[PDB]
């Protein structure tokens, strides 16, 4: 089997992407944030504290004839941006782009933190990291991909995120029309539960390529590109006026700038992030100071190839026995 679903930016900055997901019988369609950096599928629901729901579409298990409480199971998760959610667990039928998993753990939120409440466009998350990170207790649960894997034509999914435009998540096949040139595959470590790989280096604008190993994770659920302070300093040094602002919370730059591109290495291949991808607009409405899309990972504890990087590529998440990652230009 295969599935194919369109993923759509939630706003004009590509702050996140939502993908429609069918849950239950009859289908309840919720728009979920596909997150290769976590491993819980959780949803706003009829169980979510009412004051913490503000415009989201909710999953109502009692209206699904295929929903079953997973007795005793609870979940609770905190993300790298400080947001969090928790609740209990159902199993139900979940379909993504025509691909159907029965008995999928659907984690029903009883509580969500304010950033989730305040984002009316995101109805929940669909985790696509390794199931070892799943937070369901006392019985850890499998991701949607893990559950679907054996039924897929090929044990892969691909992320084709758009710049200011819709893109695609495909399951079970590689769309050879969706990229240019060839796909370069690179090794993955699953030791931390992430799609963790080592970039072979970087260049800033038309600058010479610096060969250097950068360990990081391919994370569709993170908006920006977080890299070592040395790298990030070298990038922003090429933008007149750019500076790190502790009060704003990272590198800012004059909105009048033309940003240089940023290239990262995948083995011998190179992915080029156009400078426009790195512009996240005024720090506050009407400001002429703009927020940078490349930020330091110092104090995160890991480098993160988030949407800013991933949207510049066609990305293959290969979940074969030995997982790998593939990157192509597009």
Curated annotation (Swiss-Prot):
Disulfide bonds join 255-290. The active site is at residues 35, 199. Its EC number is 3.4.23.22. Keywords: Aspartyl protease, Disulfide bond, Hydrolase, Protease, Signal, Zymogen. The keyword Secreted does not apply. It comes from the Eukaryota. Residues 17-328 form the Peptidase A1 domain. One of its GO terms (molecular function) is aspartic-type endopeptidase activity. One of its GO terms (biological process) is proteolysis. It catalyses: Hydrolysis of proteins with specificity similar to that of pepsin A, prefers hydrophobic residues at P1 and P1', but does not cleave 14-Ala-|-Leu-15 in the B chain of insulin or Z-Glu-Tyr. Clots milk. It is an enzyme of class 3 (hydrolase). Belongs to the peptidase A1 family. This is Endothiapepsin. It comes from Cryphonectria parasitica (Chestnut blight fungus). The lineage of its organism: Eukaryota, Fungi, Dikarya, Ascomycota, Pezizomycotina. The gene is EAPA.
